[model samples]
Target: MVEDILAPGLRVVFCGINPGLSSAGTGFPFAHPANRFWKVIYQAGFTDRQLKPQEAQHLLDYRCGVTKLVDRPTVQANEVSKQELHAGGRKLIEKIEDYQPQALAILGKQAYEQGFSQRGAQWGKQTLTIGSTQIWVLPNPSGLSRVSLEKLVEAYRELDQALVV
Candidate 1:
């Protein structure tokens, strides 16, 4: 399976739960057909132009990057075990240490809770830090997330503010 590292700067890094089959096949994070990640990033004002999976390289111009909690690919993120989540979380810290992103936005609440053992965490800015990197928990952009577009917009706005300031 191939993993995507969208960008390599210290501005912002987005961490996903894991790679889905589509992403694994394409070697791009959020490559699933139903995923709204590209749209959300455009709507959230992170980019002046919308990007296709093939245009993922543009993210580096914005100083945004993507990675996963686990490197393995599966049909569903739930296929990952709790032990894998913890191990992935530890590895994530290593990424933070190496990349030194200003903020790390984790893309799934359940994954964050499982990987970080922070069950009671809320839906916006998180209270913890990965070393000097600020942490935030945003809704997963997978079509199955069930979060309304309005709610997703609100969360993205918050994340936008966090990234800018």
Candidate 2:
């Protein structure tokens, strides 16, 4: 399984649903070359430059971290259970309370809704917060998502601007 790249006082903690096969095999988040995560973050100005999964730790330099709602890897995220999502949601709450990042950017619409029990929730900044930490939901940067790359970058750029204090 891929490991989390978390630290206290981060600008953002990007939470994906879980690692896919490529990431699991490499111990890196979003390791699949086809995954748009790396490109999206850079284009959205979350990072100074596009970084590869092999250098994911360098995300800390941009005050960013990566983690998953479910730690377990699967061929398809649909394989995850509601029970696990709830369990992971509880842990995520604890994690946000502890780390206190400026924002928690959940990278999947369905995953955030299921994991946190925020049914009917939509994308972009959310009203609910963990402590003082803000919440934002963006479509997962998977090849599976029909949302275009330009739209994804624009959405993330909105979050990036919101993070500015």
Candidate 3:
């Protein structure tokens, strides 16, 4: 049950699938020890250094933000149904429109696809926008993700370069 770290005029708002049990219990997004979210953001040039989950609020200093597509907590993202994702995605669109960040980076391709009801969405920028906010799909930074850290950083770097920061 972590609150979204977001505000208007952010450089990017990172959106994840949903909160995991560890994150919900700890009151932090990506709270699991194995999660690479903080590290990836640092290596991708979104942060000056790797931040602890407790430091999530500091992301605003870097003009970054964090949020979840769904509010429910689960042991695994697979527990979320397509219907829920679709509904969440709709809500997310409204949130993005209200906050109006420069870009919206969805952390998981599957989540982006199912949530937005889009098929064959690839990594990097997508041909979508919420109001004027651009949309980008990033590799999942979950500990269990098959995407290597090097590749994840590389992918994120692309978005970093595109950002107005």
Candidate 4:
């Protein structure tokens, strides 16, 4: 969607599978009105209040940023290919190593598995560490997802705690 909000020495870098058409069009991540992406951000304790997509840049202030595995925009995340995901994942690894964030939170388990080729991966912390960074596999917060906002809140809180461990 929007350009990457990354900077040096961030604590967390959010790597989404790619941008949905709605998000890309608006130049915002999770801009689809129904998407819980922004809501869960606050509920997860990343922020004190819910932020609109326009406020994504502010995440950098808290040592967080956003990027996409693939640059392509699609109506459905499913339309992106495994090859693209794998390639994007590799690029993400390079960026993570360069920026050296404390963690990189991949927003979907399947995406993390496919892109990183860690096919047996599960939710929460993954054994894979990209450079010195911990990898957190979190539930996707798309509106279409079955995972509830409350569950995402718990997961984000756990990831937040891991940053201190």
Candidate 5:
């Protein structure tokens, strides 16, 4: 299954809005080959080498991890309602409280705003903080996002810089 990969003291936890049907079917976090999540992470300097969807667990080796705003698999992210997204936000808060990741980077703009009800969230480092955990918003790397891979890489790099500083 496209389960969450998380642990205590992770440098950053990448949070996608949810798992798409194709990703869940393949049991890969971002199995859709067109998705730029893997390449973007590598390009943004989070990893020395690009990771395949099946090798997602390798992220923990870099002090990073993955999770989602919602666990449900749907054809599109829109299928997961805002209420569920908010609920997922609550659950994520619990996780951070226990694990205490240094930073939480949401891989989608709307997901960050709607899921956490942080309206007017801009790209890059956010003013929002959950206890000691910092929050960041990055452009989604999904092919459906309409944002260029270069732009997504740029956004992720911004997050990378924040975590470093």
Candidate 6:
């Protein structure tokens, strides 16, 4: 199982469905070459400059952290079982309770829906809360995801704004 990547008083905690093999190997979230997470986050104004996977620890400097709904690492998120998602959701809640990030941004709608048991929830800042932490659903940054990079960037920016207080 993969361990949670977090820092005390993290303002934004990005929750992916699970860690991809590349991320697991590199010990960085969204480290795969095809993943647009770093690019989108930079373009969305979350960081002063683009950062490489090797510099992922810098996210903590910006009050950001990365984790996953499920602790397991896989080559593809689709491989995760629905049961795992639900169980992971409970675990994620525990993390939120402990870390208390300003926002918990889930990286895919399907994962968000499965994990939260809310099939109809849309992207953007969700009305729900994990304890006192706000929830936001964002498009997956993997190249295979259906959402375009522009759309993903917009959604990320929206989530970033929510984290601003």
Winning candidate number (TM-score)? 3
- The residue-level lDDT of candidate 3 at 4 comes to 94
lDDT of 6 at 87: 90
lDDT comparison, 2 vs 6, better candidate? 2
Off by over 4 Å in 1: 6-8
Q: Which is the winner by lDDT between candidate 2 and candidate 5? A: 2
Q: In terms of lDDT, which candidate is stronger, 1 or 3?
A: 3
Model 6 score (lDDT): 0.86
Tens digits of per-residue lDDT, candidate 3, 80-151, equal 888888889988998998899999999998889988899988788998888899999998888888899999
Mind giving the per-residue lDDT tens digits that candidate 4 earns over 42-118?
A: 77767777888888888887778888889999988889998888888778888888888888999998799878988
Error of 3 at 25 (Å): 0.6
Error of model 2, residue 42, in angstroms: 0.1
What ranges in model 2 sit over 4 Å off? none
Clashes of each: 0, 0, 0, 0, 0, 0
For residues 20-120, write the lDDT of model 2, one tens digit per residue: 99999999899998899999999999998999999999999999998888988888777888888878998898988989999999988888888889888
Which consecutive 10 residues in model 3 have the weakest lDDT in total? 156-165
lDDT of 6 at 114: 89
**C-alpha lDDT score of every prediction, in listed order:** 0.81, 0.90, 0.90, 0.85, 0.87, 0.86
lDDT of 5 at 67: 88
Native-to-model Cα distance after best TM-score fit, residue 39 in candidate 3, in Å? 0.3
Q: lDDT by residue for model 1 over 1-165, one digit each (tens)? A: 655564446577888888889988987778887888888887887777878877776788877888889988888887898888888888888888888888888988888988898888888888799878889889988877898776776787777776664
- Residue 88's C-alpha lDDT in candidate 3? 94
lDDT value for candidate 5? 0.87
| Candidate 3 error regions (>4 Å) | none
Choose 4 or 6, whichever is better by lDDT: 6
Estimated TM-score for each candidate: 0.92, 0.96, 0.97, 0.95, 0.95, 0.93
Model 5 poorest ten-residue lDDT run: 156-165
List residue ranges in candidate 6 displaced over 4 A.
1-3
For model 2, the run of ten residues with the poorest summed lDDT: 75-84
User: Which regions of candidate 5 deviate over 4 angstroms?
Assistant: none
